[PDB]
Amino acid sequence: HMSDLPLRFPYGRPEFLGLSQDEVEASADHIARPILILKETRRLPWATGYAEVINAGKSTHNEDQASCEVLTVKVSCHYWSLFDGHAGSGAAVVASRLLQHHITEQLQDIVDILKIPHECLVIGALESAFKEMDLQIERERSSYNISGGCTALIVICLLGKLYVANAGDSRAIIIRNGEIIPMSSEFTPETERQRLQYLAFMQPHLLGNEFTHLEFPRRVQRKELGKKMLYRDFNMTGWAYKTIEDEDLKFPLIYGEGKKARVMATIGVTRGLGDHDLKVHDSNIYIKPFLSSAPEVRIYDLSKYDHGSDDVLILATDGLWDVLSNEEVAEAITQFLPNCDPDDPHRYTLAAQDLVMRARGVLKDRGWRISNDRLGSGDDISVYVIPLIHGNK
Amino acid sequence: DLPLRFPYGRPEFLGLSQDEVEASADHIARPILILKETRRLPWATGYAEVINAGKSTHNEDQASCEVLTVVSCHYWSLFDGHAGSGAAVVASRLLQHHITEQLQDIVDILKKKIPHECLVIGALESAFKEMDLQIERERSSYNISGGCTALIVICLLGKLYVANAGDSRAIIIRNGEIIPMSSEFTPETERQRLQYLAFMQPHLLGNEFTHLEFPRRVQRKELGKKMLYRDFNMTGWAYKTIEDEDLKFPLIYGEGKKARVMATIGVTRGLGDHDLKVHDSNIYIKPFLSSAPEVRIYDLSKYDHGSDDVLILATDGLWDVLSNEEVAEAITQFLPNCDPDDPHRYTLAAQDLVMRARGVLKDRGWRISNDRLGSGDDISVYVIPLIHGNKL
Ligand SMILES: [Mg+2]
Ligand SMILES: [Mg+2]
Ligand SMILES: [Mn+2]
Ligand SMILES: [Mn+2]
Ligand SMILES: [Mn+2]
Ligand SMILES: [Mn+2]
Ligand SMILES: [Mn+2]
Ligand SMILES: [Mn+2]
């Protein structure tokens, strides 16, 4: 039904890039994989740095989207956002254009007060904004082709405080005098296992008589019927023994380890927007009941520290973090920025370009390779480098 | 009524006769009972307790401490009963048997890659659950009154496992530093789980409650007006027009030590309470409670502990009037006045903590330092010396 409907918004790259229609096509080169950076002739707020590169060939379009502007609540609200789309570009494009409007609307309900701690009203506003964005996608689903879904990582600076709201598996970290301050956590079948099992237990019909909510160390085989095995339930952190009993032969709700962890054999990320009609392969079981649009929000008070020109906030999609650790990013940032004149305004964009290049690697004979012959990232990669000096009181 | 599953009593290691128990239950004098010096506990653990100031005729705290045979396994436990002493008494005798049996399923292994620690944790988690299931079915044949919280510790193969299902608390004091070893399970700390369940299963509210949380009691006058609220998916607050459903009593009400689920109870985990209902109604509370504990591990081999490094276990009778910092300050000023070789050290430290929470009674209620109100609750304190857990 949705493939019969027009697009809500046309596909494109982040609008602040200012790319023509021909530059967009030139960027979608899976073999050359050109790293796009912000033109010096265009400045982002706070001289924010940005860089991106398309995937190595798994989807025709770059499915990351990004938005950055200064909102006005009828007070100023700086806004940065990254969306990692999957199974289509539609949700990430829609989110990159409309979520900031939901945030502005929710903040407007509480702005007289900003002038229960106020920080909890801003958190509540951001949480309501994520939900209302997903609700809008849900009902506009029937008039427009809003394909797939997306993760959502946004940050606002409001009255001297950074709010980092994450619903997905992108990541935000602060590098301050060389130390790593994490500002987000990822939501996967692994990190959300107990919530997912709890829902499956309380609402068994969501399992379509195809899955069991119990976790096992490996796939349970029919020949193990009547035998003892380790299992883990929703209220357990550890493992205990159990007699295998018919029901345990169903496919597990949670399966796989780390980046291979999956819910109902389908998805490896459990929060974001879209995916309303997503189904398990070869069945009619819906995935969305196990997904959530609700972000985790973390605050960084910019007043409690005097920030140098090399103290930055990094936002990136998993195209960076899947091959670079927080320590490699910290090492790279602190190694690069002291080579740029502190007054150079293109200097955080070059830092973001350096991060993308280190994760993308170079195209060798057997694929993309980074340092230590390691495999380079074949994904879309998008990176913000936000200089925290601009938030100094 | 039904026969008792066990006779009421006080911790066995107190070596009390029946006549000493009756004398100890003085709501006016409130004598502080301590481990006799002639009686040594594992690791020379200190223990002291005192009865409440009048809310229940019996002391509803219970405690048990022994060496389990699996390999040997040191075991300390504290239970804070409510609405009767039965559940606390049963748990103080039978939870160690459930723990012992769960550990026997995995003891060979201890001598996807599952770390051994996770097998111990899973064994404790299952033992709590199996204890509550035994209470649930023996409930019908024995008078096992009320419910109880459960805080237990085991030392197994060089590691401490602290498992908590309630609002008692365990902290380590190590070279003056406070090391928390448990978290409390209240309507407040468990709000999102509780709202989630009420939302997934609205019939549990019995058409008398709403799962939404509000900064204060929603009243008639607010109907149709804007008001802050918090749902299961929110940490912050947002505005909302009050509808007639928002007028029902909230599933979660109050804050801090005054937070309550279903207008009835201020702790959300433990054992028993299978038949606990909302007053004057057939709405059951137990679907919102959980017997599942949180387990924290302390590796004794990573630190060479001194004679004053201790693990404190106590029911809320202590923590409701003394912060972690006061307890730390109390222990670090008391113990340096005792010879490190004196086995009675930690018992005396335990008694000093109970006295500091209980206070002195005059004409203005029980008073502790700076004229603060003393604790009128049952109080039970363990002082576990970590020096006896040192490697080699
Ligand atoms: Mg005995
Ligand atoms: Mg000794
Ligand atoms: Mn993607
Ligand atoms: Mn990912
Ligand atoms: Mn990605
Ligand atoms: Mn009690
Ligand atoms: Mn309490
Ligand atoms: Mn108590």
Numbering used by the authors:
A (entry chain A): 31 to 104, 142 to 182, 235 to 512
B (entry chain B): 34 to 103, 142 to 182, 233 to 513
Quote the study on this structure.
Recent work has shown that the metal‐dependent protein phosphatase PPM1H counteracts LRRK2 by dephosphorylating Rabs. The crystal structure of PPM1H reveals a structurally conserved phosphatase fold that strikingly has evolved a 110‐residue flap domain adjacent to the active site. Cellular assays, crosslinking and 3‐D modelling suggest that the flap domain encodes the docking motif for phosphorylated Rabs. Therefore, PPM1H has acquired a Rab‐specific interaction domain within a conserved phosphatase fold.
In addition to the Mg2+ complexes, a structure of PPM1HWT (33‐514, loopDEL) with 3 Mn2+ ions was also determined at 2.2 Å resolution (MnPPM1HWT‐LD). However, all of the structures are identical with only minor differences arising from flexible loops and the presence or absence of the third metal ion at the active site. Phosphorylated Rab8a (pRab8a, GTP‐bound) from the recent structure of the pRab8a:RILPL2 complex (Waschbüsch et al, 2020) was docked onto PPM1H using Haddock software (Dominguez et al, 2003; van Zundert et al, 2016). The structure of MnPPM1HWT‐LD with 3 Mn2+ ions was used for docking with distance restraints applied between pThr72 of pRab8a and the metal ions of PPM1H. The structures of PPM1H with two Mg2+ ions failed to dock with pRab8a at the active site, presumably due to the density of negative charges in the absence of a third metal ion. The model reveals that the extended active site cleft involving the flap domain forms multiple interactions with pRab8A within the PPM1H active site. Overall, the crosslinking data and docking model are consistent with pRab8a recognition by the flap domain with phosphorylated Thr72 in the switch II motif oriented towards the active site for dephosphorylation. We also performed docking of the switch 2 α‐helical peptide from pRab8a with MnPPM1HWT‐LD. However, two of the top 10 solutions revealed a similar orientation of the phosphorylated switch 2 helix to the protein/protein dock. Overall, the complete 8/10 docking solutions of PPM1H/peptide and the top 5/6 docking solutions of PPM1H/protein suggest that the flap domain is very likely to contribute to substrate recognition.
